[PDB]
Amino acid sequence: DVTLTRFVMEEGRKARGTGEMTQLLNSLCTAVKAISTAVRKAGIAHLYGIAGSTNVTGDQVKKLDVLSNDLVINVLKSSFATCVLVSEEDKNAIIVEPEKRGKYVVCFDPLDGSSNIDCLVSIGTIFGIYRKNSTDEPSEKDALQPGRNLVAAGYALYGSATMLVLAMVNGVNCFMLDPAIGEFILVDRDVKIKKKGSIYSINEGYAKEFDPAITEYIQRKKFPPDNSAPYGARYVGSMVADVHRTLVYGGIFMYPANKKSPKGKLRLLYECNPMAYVMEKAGGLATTGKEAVLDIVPTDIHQRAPIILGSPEDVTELLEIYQKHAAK
Amino acid sequence: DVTLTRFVMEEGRKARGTGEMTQLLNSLCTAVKAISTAVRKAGIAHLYGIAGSTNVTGDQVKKLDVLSNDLVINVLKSSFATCVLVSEEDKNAIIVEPEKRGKYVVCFDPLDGSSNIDCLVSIGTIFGIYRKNSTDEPSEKDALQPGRNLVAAGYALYGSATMLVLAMVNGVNCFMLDPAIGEFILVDRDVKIKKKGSIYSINEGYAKEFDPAITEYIQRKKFPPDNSAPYGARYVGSMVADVHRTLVYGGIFMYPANKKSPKGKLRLLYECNPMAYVMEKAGGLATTGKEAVLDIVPTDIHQRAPIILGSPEDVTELLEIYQKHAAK
Amino acid sequence: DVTLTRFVMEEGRKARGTGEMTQLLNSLCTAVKAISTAVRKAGIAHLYGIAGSTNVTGDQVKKLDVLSNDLVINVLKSSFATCVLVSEEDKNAIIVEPEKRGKYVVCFDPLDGSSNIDCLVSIGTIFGIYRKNSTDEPSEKDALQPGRNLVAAGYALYGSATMLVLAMVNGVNCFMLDPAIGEFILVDRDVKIKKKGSIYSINEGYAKEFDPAITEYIQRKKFPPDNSAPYGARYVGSMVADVHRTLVYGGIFMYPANKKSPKGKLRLLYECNPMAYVMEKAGGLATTGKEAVLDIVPTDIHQRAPIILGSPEDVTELLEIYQKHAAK
Amino acid sequence: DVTLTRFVMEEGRKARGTGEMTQLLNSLCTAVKAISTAVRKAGIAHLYGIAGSTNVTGDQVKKLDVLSNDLVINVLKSSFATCVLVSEEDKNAIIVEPEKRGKYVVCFDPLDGSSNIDCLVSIGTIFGIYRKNSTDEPSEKDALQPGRNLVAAGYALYGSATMLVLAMVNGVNCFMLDPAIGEFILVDRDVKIKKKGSIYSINEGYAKEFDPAITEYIQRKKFPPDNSAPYGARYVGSMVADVHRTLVYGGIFMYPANKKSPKGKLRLLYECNPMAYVMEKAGGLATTGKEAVLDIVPTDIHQRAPIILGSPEDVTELLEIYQKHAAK
Ligand SMILES: Nc1ncnc2c1ncn2[C@@H]1O[C@H](COP(=O)(O)O)[C@@H](O)[C@H]1O
Ligand SMILES: Nc1ncnc2c1ncn2[C@@H]1O[C@H](COP(=O)(O)O)[C@@H](O)[C@H]1O
Ligand SMILES: Nc1ncnc2c1ncn2[C@@H]1O[C@H](COP(=O)(O)O)[C@@H](O)[C@H]1O
Ligand SMILES: Nc1ncnc2c1ncn2[C@@H]1O[C@H](COP(=O)(O)O)[C@@H](O)[C@H]1O
Ligand SMILES: O=P(O)(O)OC[C@H]1O[C@](O)(CO)[C@@H](O)[C@@H]1O
Ligand SMILES: O=P(O)(O)OC[C@H]1O[C@](O)(CO)[C@@H](O)[C@@H]1O
Ligand SMILES: O=P(O)(O)OC[C@H]1O[C@](O)(CO)[C@@H](O)[C@@H]1O
Ligand SMILES: O=P(O)(O)OC[C@H]1O[C@](O)(CO)[C@@H](O)[C@@H]1O
Ligand SMILES: [Zn+2]
Ligand SMILES: [Zn+2]
Ligand SMILES: [Zn+2]
Ligand SMILES: [Zn+2]
Ligand SMILES: [Zn+2]
Ligand SMILES: [Zn+2]
Ligand SMILES: [Zn+2]
Ligand SMILES: [Zn+2]
Ligand SMILES: [Zn+2]
Ligand SMILES: [Zn+2]
Ligand SMILES: [Zn+2]
Ligand SMILES: [Zn+2]
Incomplete structure (x- = not known):
């Protein structure tokens, strides 16, 4: 009976935040829902296959990788809460334009489980959120913080059901996506x-x-x-x-x-x-x-x-x- | 652009069938869609957990096992195309009432991957269809045929996307479920x-x-x-x-x-x-x-x-x- | 508990049909579901507005009119059950190629309620099915039969819920579309x-x-x-x-x-x-x-x-x- | 490309609000999505018919009226942003418990268009939001303000598509519900x-x-x-x-x-x-x-x-x- 939207907001009002963190989380939820919908019908949309490029790590890029990456990046840029983005699909860190800059740094894996895409096995999206530490202009260096500095981290799992797992200082919580109303519902607390x-x-x-x-x-x-x-x-x-x-x-x-x-x-x-x-x-x-x-x-x-x-x-x-x- | 409904019917009109096989397949497709929808939101419907019973094989029965089993059984009985049903969740073969009897024997696994249900890993439904061989009243003996006698076999996979794989004498075909219109679309032929x-x-x-x-x-x-x-x-x-x-x-x-x-x-x-x-x-x-x-x-x-x-x-x-x- | 797919098939097996009528109805159901899904999100897909053409009757063609018309026509041509199609959006009757010809003539209104599209008021799809009467090559003349000759007629209503109303010699029945499983369910019989x-x-x-x-x-x-x-x-x-x-x-x-x-x-x-x-x-x-x-x-x-x-x-x-x- | 969730939050961050108004709006959006999903399949869920009671105005209460009313009330009470609720389905104003009290007063019509429910014609939900004016304990008197005092007002329309129209001091905006991702998208600004x-x-x-x-x-x-x-x-x-x-x-x-x-x-x-x-x-x-x-x-x-x-x-x-x- 508790939606992630309410959870995140209620958690934000208690932490007395300016609101960009809450909006950052809201944006990720929207991106996750968009990715999930695409994933549940990828084959039909002809989203299976290679994109024609290779990332820095050396992996062969897939079409769903591109779609998911595009969704996350676009939703994060319009959240007005990020300044530096690091994606598994991008050679270098992405610096958000001053106009849309926020103080959060986001490292993400738009689509994890590349080798399992075509055989319909579970795949997902992973993310980690940091608060900008430097005082100078945002750069790739701002994403080079140890994991212990994370303010929030989690993943969306596109399995038999779609689950969004979110971890923060208070603990870990699991929310399941209800495809009918497009809301993630808390199913496993702390x-x-x-x-x-x-x-x-x-x-x-x-x-x-x-x-x-x-x-x-x-x-x-x-x-x-x-x-x-x-x-x-x-x-x-x-x-x-x-x-x-x-x-x-x-x-x-x-x-x-x-x-x-x-x-x-x-x-x-x-x-x-x-x-x-x-x-x-x-x-x-x-x-x-x-x-x-x-x-x-x-x-x-x-x-x-x-x-x-x-x-x-x-x-x-x-x-x-x-x-x-x-x-x- | 080719739906399973059209595929099955066009395949039935070419084989000049009375129509019960086609209807049997139509019924399974409907059951598979119902199961898929339930699976994609199981946690929210509180469908995770044990049912309180143990089947012949000794496995601990789960709630989704019961739901899926009930769906398959009910849809097969009203297809008016089956006479004997064998389920992994039922101690003995199910004999369909004379009124709703057909000449097909169906052996199925309503929900395969029990141990993976709670962790949201891929699960599915498996089925095999036989034609009644005996001339006497339908019984459990009618399901005791070697696999080589199958007329149709396949499975529904509830993974990142839902796929229905159907095999018959002509070959194997894969159909992906498009959640938006509730139709399985041919994505991999022969x-x-x-x-x-x-x-x-x-x-x-x-x-x-x-x-x-x-x-x-x-x-x-x-x-x-x-x-x-x-x-x-x-x-x-x-x-x-x-x-x-x-x-x-x-x-x-x-x-x-x-x-x-x-x-x-x-x-x-x-x-x-x-x-x-x-x-x-x-x-x-x-x-x-x-x-x-x-x-x-x-x-x-x-x-x-x-x-x-x-x-x-x-x-x-x-x-x-x-x-x-x-x-x- | 009775799906339109089962209804139509069970009704076809009782009438001992070759199967093209049943398939014709199956095709319409699929088209109706596709149209309904598009209609429930038309504004988002930018489907509101004029197409840039005027039909014979003099109405200004809309984008949804084109989409719906295209869906119905394409699904009817691949049903292998029609020979002549008359649409409100086409100046002349459409003659199906010999390869895909069937003996049924279909007159339809792909999207009825044009003036109500943009204000989100209920709209729908209307159809009438005739059996080819002539013995010569199919032509526009085959659709010029009095309504009393209809074998089947009905409409899909895209209102608060999507309903498919089907009338045949046996009577009128109403089926509601369950968006979750993509099946029309009988809700009002005879x-x-x-x-x-x-x-x-x-x-x-x-x-x-x-x-x-x-x-x-x-x-x-x-x-x-x-x-x-x-x-x-x-x-x-x-x-x-x-x-x-x-x-x-x-x-x-x-x-x-x-x-x-x-x-x-x-x-x-x-x-x-x-x-x-x-x-x-x-x-x-x-x-x-x-x-x-x-x-x-x-x-x-x-x-x-x-x-x-x-x-x-x-x-x-x-x-x-x-x-x-x-x-x- | 602009979701209502982002719209409301971005609008809240600009107005420098404590966050309860934003959450109040978020709650309504969730209730509207839940109502829309129920409405699009009401007949199947047997939600058509009378409930067995008559409201103060004298109207015969319907089942969907009850469901919608229950959804709105429950979602508003957990928004922690309301103190007094006035519903067309309730004889007296509802006073929210101190624990869950907020400073907003909400007057709503959970399901408008009662006589059109059974024939599947468009229906909807209407709401008006006021800020508590009195200083004493919240009561029915707090909802007795002239319309000119509204801070926000609007309606959800469950027509061919579901639309949420929201009006505030800045103007009127229309958001269409995308059933696939469960997000309202801005389609008509100002x-x-x-x-x-x-x-x-x-x-x-x-x-x-x-x-x-x-x-x-x-x-x-x-x-x-x-x-x-x-x-x-x-x-x-x-x-x-x-x-x-x-x-x-x-x-x-x-x-x-x-x-x-x-x-x-x-x-x-x-x-x-x-x-x-x-x-x-x-x-x-x-x-x-x-x-x-x-x-x-x-x-x-x-x-x-x-x-x-x-x-x-x-x-x-x-x-x-x-x-x-x-x-x-
Ligand atoms: N919705 C939220 N959930 C949890 N913690 C939050 C939330 N919003 C803000 N915070 C905390 O408050 C800090 C400041 O938030 P902000 O002003 O939005 O950047 C964040 O870095 C978090 O530690
Ligand atoms: N839709 C179909 N697809 C493939 N084979 C079919 C189909 N319908 C019937 N057949 C074949 O025709 C036989 C007789 O069909 P029936 O009269 O429906 O029992 C079946 O046992 C199959 O071998
Ligand atoms: N599914 C069905 N429902 C109702 N009547 C049917 C059905 N299939 C066939 N019929 C009747 O049988 C006739 C011949 O069917 P067909 O051989 O498919 O063209 C049709 O013109 C209808 O009158
Ligand atoms: N999301 C929002 N959109 C528009 N106006 C808002 C929003 N949040 C707050 N406001 C305005 O700011 C006032 C105080 O907000 P609050 O502190 O949340 O009660 C409200 O009464 C509105 O006038
Ligand atoms: O095939 P391997 O070497 O086991 O790699 C599997 C790993 O590859 C990844 O897809 C990363 O490339 C991980 O999601 C997964 O754990
Ligand atoms: O845990 P184990 O012994 O590897 O069993 C896995 C097997 O169990 C099953 O769930 C059957 O009980 C199969 O779906 C799967 O292959
Ligand atoms: O605006 P008018 O003249 O009442 O026309 C309404 C009629 O127009 C139509 O859209 C046909 O053009 C019908 O669906 C409807 O009954
Ligand atoms: O049948 P009548 O008198 O035109 O009433 C219609 C009105 O009734 C209502 O349902 C209110 O009871 C309104 O939504 C609508 O405008
Ligand atoms: Zn990779
Ligand atoms: Zn990865
Ligand atoms: Zn990756
Ligand atoms: Zn088992
Ligand atoms: Zn199994
Ligand atoms: Zn099993
Ligand atoms: Zn017209
Ligand atoms: Zn018309
Ligand atoms: Zn028309
Ligand atoms: Zn009323
Ligand atoms: Zn009203
Ligand atoms: Zn009302």
Whole structure:
């Protein structure tokens, strides 16, 4: 019975804000609804396929990537609440014109789960919001803040149903989109991740390339030393989907470094940080295996980072393995 | 520009049918649309959670399972085209009253992907249609036909978009649901699976319980003897989603036997057979590792069977491993 | 619980049809849903405004007129059930190519209520279906049959809700469109108009031009000789809306001849005949004031005719006035 | 490209408001969307019919009336921006609990056009917002302010498309609901009514009861003294629909007093005032024929008032007739 629109406004009136943060969130909600509608009928609109370009990270751009990116950018520019935007689909940070400038910096992944688009598997949108720290003219440097500085982070999941998960200092909340009235409804308040799960999520196709710690951990999940039942495996292939399941079911999600991705594949600014923030606000952990994801100070808007996140006891067990091998 | 309604009718007029098959298909389409709408807003309608009962196979029944099951059953009974119905949610076969009896037997899985319902991961509906073979009164025995006898089989996938995949003697076709007008639109005609893929799909959590063949194959996917790049791994956890990806991307999907499921987990009548039929009509293969899934003559409407399906070259490679170990 | 798709098919299986009539009806339903979706968001799609052309009758063509006309024509041509099409938006009858020819002739008004489009008042689509009578090549002459020869007639009403009213030899039935699942649901079966109503519908702006009979009748509705309460007046301005209200509430609808429209304004083939058929099948009457609308043999596909329709007692009272003045 | 959500917020940030007005408007938008969705499928949900009660004005309450009333009331109470609510469906004013109290007073007509519900003709929702004037505890007296004191007024029209018309000191704006994304989009900015129209809207069924002025005016519309073409007549029967057409097409709408309704039928607080405000902000006029509607100080929350509104030249002509007869 509580809509996201009311939630965000009521939360804004309590925080006594000028109103641009609230409007920033309202804009994202609108963009998310537009993206969801397009996604639920993409094939019919001939939105499946490549766009004909390659982004900095090296991924092949898809048509839905372009549409989603365009929607987010346009809605954020007219929110009059942003000054710098960093997108997975743009080589450089986008500087909003003075006229439409706000004090918020937004890092986003317009469409996450590229490889799953054509097979209709869950995909989504990820975002992280920062407050401008510098006093000088807005630049790409303003998006180079550690995740711990986020004011808000979350993601839209276009799965069997569309969910918008929003995390802020107060905690994590889940809102489901009701397609009939175009409103996100609060369905899970102050979400807390289970202390320990029974599912591990990772692409084992890179087994020959995993470091000794990941290798040992996976072996432990399949052949438990305490003779307990093995963990079940799940790997949707879309970070947003695997992470959301990790949040509501508990367990662990991993994307460590490998031969082709020496520093991990996932991007720090718009993939790792937003999810690390959601995880920590839900009582979970997010580490590269050597340091907290949210403490990393980025030097490249598109830098990558290995990431392990989920239930605290599971992530801690893996961390202990990394520590053990480091003292070896 | 071609709707499923037109497709099915035009296909029926060419086959010169009395019209009950066409109506049977029309009924399924309506049920699928109703299920999709409910699925896209399940959380809001409080449809997440257990129903309070356990089916024959031993699974814990969910609320969406009940809703979907009720929809399919009711729509099939009023289609005046069925005489015997076998559902994953019903202990025994359902015998349609004489008044509403038709000559078709339908085996279905109202909602596949139970464990993925609550985390919003893709789920779906699977069905297989047989023509009554006996001459005596319709009974559970009429659903105990080998998959090779299917007249039609397919599934609805409630993923980022809703897709209805239908297979018949003429081939496999994919129709996407356009939520705005409530019509499934043909988006992929006469689908053919790739001869060889680059993705393997299986729950490796059961590694300690896999037979030597599966174990050897997975090792080969991670450490290719020809030194080629390893296969990527994907396991959504919902048979319908993993199978659909296998169909459009190619590769292999596996659910072999393990300690808890000595004869595999997936059910022959409404999970394995429908997908095996779709796969073979698309030029793919479906085997237990020892025999063709579609050739198995069932003796229990709820019997399980191990299943390996997908691209012919991939499935064949695994089969060769099974043959090698059998002659060992 | 009964969908139009099931209704039409079940009705087709009982009539033992080749299937093209059923498919013809299925095609119209699809076109109606597409038109309804466009109508509910026309302003946003910039569909309000003129197209830049004038039809034979002299009306200024609108953009929605073009869209609706295009949808109906395209869906009817691919139904493989029509041979001649007459549209209010086309100067001449449309002859379907031999390849896609069927034996049905369809006269339709793609979008009725032109003057009400921009103010968001109810509009709709009207249609009448005939069976080809001639043996020679299909031509415009095949649409020149009296309304009494109709096999099916009806209209889609895009009002507060979208309704599809279908009339055939068996009677009149009303189906409401459920936007969520894109299915028309039977809500009013075997509709019968009240014997006498309490509402008269006519544009009194043409008062100076009305014939003595209409003038006397209206005076009687405002100043009842039996001292009963006067009839209420209602004139939406869209024939489909005024006629539908007349059907479900009873009463009378009138569009007599006037100075600018000596033979009435409404068109016989796709406005008057379809509604006259619906009215008579519902137990109502439809007259020009001098003869039954359905008995008129047209000589022009776009000829006009005065029309009075609705509850039998009300229409009869007006007819008696016409008879009285004719014997004067 | 401009959503109502953005419009209202951007308008609120410019007016430097605490945020409850913005939230009040956001709440109404949500209620309007919920009502629209229900309306577009009312028949299917069995929402047509009487509720079993009669309101103070004497109207027979319908089911949709109850649903709409419940939605508006509940959404307004949780907006934390209202203190007194006056509904056409409630005998007395509703006093919001201290906990959820705001400083705004809202008078509304949850569902206008009762007699048109069952025939699917356009219906809507009307509202007027006042700022609490008193300093003492909120009571019914706080809603007894003249229309000139309104801070905001408007209506939702559930016609061929759903439109939300909002009027405030800055002017009148029209937003169309896009059912796909559940957002109202600005389609008509700073609307201004034509100085003179060519349509008169009134129920002429009450002709025997009209005062001499109305009678003379109508005669003038049918038999123009300047020999110009007569005005066309339109009377949908739902105030919201007739008024909206008057706004966008120009012309005049009239509901004068008659035998059964000596002081007019329409209610001052939630029918006449909101529309009079919209009209005047659009450059139109609204009079009882003897005084400006917005200047009337109400003494009963459900009092009625005769109303004449629309294009200034048309309303003025009628006013001159009233003046002429008063000096007679
Ligand atoms: N809707 C909201 N929900 C939560 N926190 C908010 C909201 N609006 C403002 N805030 C907080 O107040 C600060 C200032 O808001 P603003 O003046 O809109 O930039 C933000 O950076 C947030 O920390
Ligand atoms: N719509 C259809 N699409 C494909 N095959 C059909 C269709 N309708 C009928 N058939 C074929 O014709 C047979 C007889 O149809 P029926 O008389 O409806 O039971 C079916 O068992 C199918 O093999
Ligand atoms: N779905 C249907 N509903 C009602 N009457 C039908 C239907 N299908 C066929 N008919 C009747 O049967 C005749 C022949 O149908 P067809 O062979 O499809 O042209 C039609 O002209 C109708 O009179
Ligand atoms: N969203 C808005 N649009 C227009 N005027 C507004 C808005 N919000 C506030 N106002 C104006 O500012 C006043 C105070 O707003 P509030 O503090 O929210 O009660 C209102 O009574 C309006 O006159
Ligand atoms: O195919 P891989 O290497 O497992 O990559 C999967 C990852 O790729 C991404 O699409 C990013 O490119 C993530 O959403 C997902 O976690
Ligand atoms: O958790 P597991 O053992 O991998 O089971 C997954 C399988 O379970 C099912 O939900 C059937 O119960 C399938 O849809 C899916 O393939
Ligand atoms: O404005 P008038 O002359 O009353 O015409 C109204 C008629 O015009 C039409 O739009 C046909 O042109 C009908 O739908 C409607 O009954
Ligand atoms: O049937 P009548 O007397 O013309 O009343 C119509 C009026 O009734 C109302 O429904 C109010 O009861 C208005 O919406 C409309 O203007
Ligand atoms: Zn990418
Ligand atoms: Zn991504
Ligand atoms: Zn991306
Ligand atoms: Zn199950
Ligand atoms: Zn299943
Ligand atoms: Zn199931
Ligand atoms: Zn026209
Ligand atoms: Zn027309
Ligand atoms: Zn027309
Ligand atoms: Zn009322
Ligand atoms: Zn009203
Ligand atoms: Zn009302």
